[PDB]
Design a protein around this ligand. Structure first.
Ligand SMILES: N=C(N)NCCCNC(=O)[C@@H]1CCCCN1C(=O)[C@@H](CC1CCCCC1)NCC(=O)O
Ligand SMILES: [Ca+2]
Length: 223
């Protein structure tokens, strides 16, 4: 997260860290047994880490659970990142508590202008590399689809939306992938892609979760 702020230990209890010997992507707990992340974060051998703040220090509120199965969206296109969403099931249910909680799915999509909270352990430098060990947060509004499509001509589909600032300075970045974009208490987005980080006229692009609610519900009930 570039231009963001330290969230504060466990203030975003639904945030998860996907670990394969190291943290490689973020994710969101939707219930005691299921996590939603980005399809491009797909990998074999994933351990889901919950109740995390500093990812390099065992602080006492963590829950480390292995993934039993991963399901990438049937229409995921790795070339364009359209349908960038994947569901991960935990080998055993997590114990929900004040520091480990699930995030609600949207009943409807949000509109441009709505403020959202994006979080992660990704790079904090636009022109450089510096990875924080504690969770970073960023408040940013959903931008109009016209602003989004003007920035990325011919690359934005109906399954995507832009969020951030056209002036640059604040944006998600490498390492934030798969992380949550929560607006009005609902999971509205998943950190997907962008062009660099915090660059003028190059906002972040996110998977539009509201379009996948039915798929999510059907898939988790049958697995
Ligand atoms: N930058 C912002 N605002 N948010 C960070 C999102 C992180 N996602 C990626 O880096 C993804 C991860 C999967 C590989 C690609 N990669 C990118 O962002 C690519 C985007 C392109 C990949 C192929 C489909 C078209 C878009 N580029 C990164 C960059 O431009 O720096
Ligand atoms: Ca820790």
């Amino acid at each position: 997260i570039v231009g963001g702020y330290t969230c504060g230990a466990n203030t975003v209890p639904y945030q998860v860290s996907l670990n394969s010997g190291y943290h490689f992507c973020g994710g969101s707990l939707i219930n005691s047994q299921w996590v939603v992340s980005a399809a491009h974060c797909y990998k074999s051998g994933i351990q889901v880490r919950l109740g995390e703040d500093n990812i390099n220090v065992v602080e006492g509120n963590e829950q480390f659970i292995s993934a039993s199965k991963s399901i990438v969206h049937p229409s995921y296109n790795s070339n364009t990142l359209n349908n960038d969403i994947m569901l991960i099931k935990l080998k055993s249910a997590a114990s929900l508590n004040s520091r480990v909680a699930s995030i609600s799915l949207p009943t409807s999509c949000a509109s441009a202008g709505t403020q959202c909270l994006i979080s992660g352990w990704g790079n904090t430098k636009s022109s450089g590399t510096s990875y924080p060990d504690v969770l970073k947060c960023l408040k940013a509004p959903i931008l109009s689809d016209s602003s989004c499509k003007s920035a990325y001509p011919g690359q934005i589909t109906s399954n995507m939306f832009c969020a951030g600032y056209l002036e640059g300075g604040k944006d998600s970045c490498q390492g934030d992938s798969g992380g949550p974009v929560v607006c009005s208490g609902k999971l509205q987005g998943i950190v997907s892609w962008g062009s660099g980080c915090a660059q003028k006229n190059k906002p972040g692009v996110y998977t539009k979760v509201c379009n996948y609610v039915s798929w999510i519900k059907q898939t988790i009930a049958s697995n």
